[PDB]
């Protein structure tokens, strides 16, 4: 899947109604002013992401609108849209489960969590739910491998899961309520499961051993 060739569809066509709210245009101005003038196409990453933030799935009309907003040729927008991850070019459910399966994450039987996702939703890897809520796909090492096999939905990490812990969060999102983004078994950020092997003392004080006239 994930075909990098767009085709004219009634849902995704140049006609497709896409635009930005006035607040979205204010955000785009903020993105533009961050970068030096003359090189403004460099801001093509957030604004198009901003489109996601208001639409999720990005129609070809969204790419064309971003191209005309940033005064950049349309395919220069298409390239960054089709070369980076996320940037969903096909409609997806509002919730978007992403379970890492890389080696450090897989070692603690991440496949158990994967099959638990599958059995809870009935859907398989890829396809979204028939009710258009969740999207069962896998991701690479997103940067939370130090915890137990963990998943990210939209913009919420959950760490230190277990084939059991995912069930509650899944039917929480299915029920509408949001689970708390964080590890599911102690270990607030990354501390040892047994306890605190370090950082167990009050912190350093300002002025600790400096050379005074440094």
């Amino acid at each position: 899947g994930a075909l990098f060739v767009h085709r004219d569809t009634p849902e995704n066509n140049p006609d497709t109604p896409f635009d930005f709210t006035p607040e979205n245009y204010k955000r785009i101005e903020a993105i533009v002013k961050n970068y030096p003038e003359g090189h403004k196409a460099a801001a093509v990453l957030p604004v198009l992401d901003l489109a996601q933030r208001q639409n999720g799935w990005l129609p070809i009309s969204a790419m064309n609108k971003v191209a005309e907003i940033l005064q950049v040729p349309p395919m220069r927008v298409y390239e960054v849209a089709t070369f980076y991850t996320m940037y969903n070019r096909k409609p997806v459910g509002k919730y978007h489960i992403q379970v890492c399966t890389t080696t450090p994450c897989m070692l603690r039987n991440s496949d158990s969590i994967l099959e638990a996702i599958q059995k809870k939703l009935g859907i398989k890897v890829g396809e979204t739910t028939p009710d258009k809520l969740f999207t069962l796909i896998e991701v690479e090492c997103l940067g939370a491998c130090v915890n137990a096999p963990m998943v990210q939905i939209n913009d919420n990490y959950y760490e230190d899961l277990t084939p059991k812990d995912i069930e509650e969060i899944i039917d929480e999102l299915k029920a509408g309520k949001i689970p708390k983004p964080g590890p599911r078994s102690g270990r607030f950020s990354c501390e040892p499961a047994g306890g605190l092997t370090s950082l167990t003392e009050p912190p350093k004080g300002p002025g600790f051993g400096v050379q005074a006239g440094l």
């Binding site: 204010k26 955000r27 903020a30 993105i31 002013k33 961050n34 970068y35 030096p36 003038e37 003359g38 090189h39 403004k40 196409a41 957030p46 901003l50 933030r53 005064q71 939209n154 913009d155 708390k180 983004p181 964080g182 607030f188 950020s189 605190l196 950082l199 167990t200 009050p202």
Partner: protein, 45 residues
């Protein structure tokens, strides 16, 4: 006063809207400086 060594206070990240990035980026825009000019407004000009 007693420093609790087993608590987490990075909790405000839980209640973050989908626009939170740009929501305070727009406010931060005020505390900035003029960007340097490359001359031509576009590399295509």
């Amino acid at each position: 006063e007693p420093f609790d060594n087993s608590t987490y206070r990075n909790l405000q990240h839980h209640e973050y809207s989908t626009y939170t990035f740009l929501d305070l980026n727009v406010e931060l825009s005020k505390f900035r400086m003029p960007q340097p000019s490359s001359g031509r407004q576009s590399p295509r000009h």
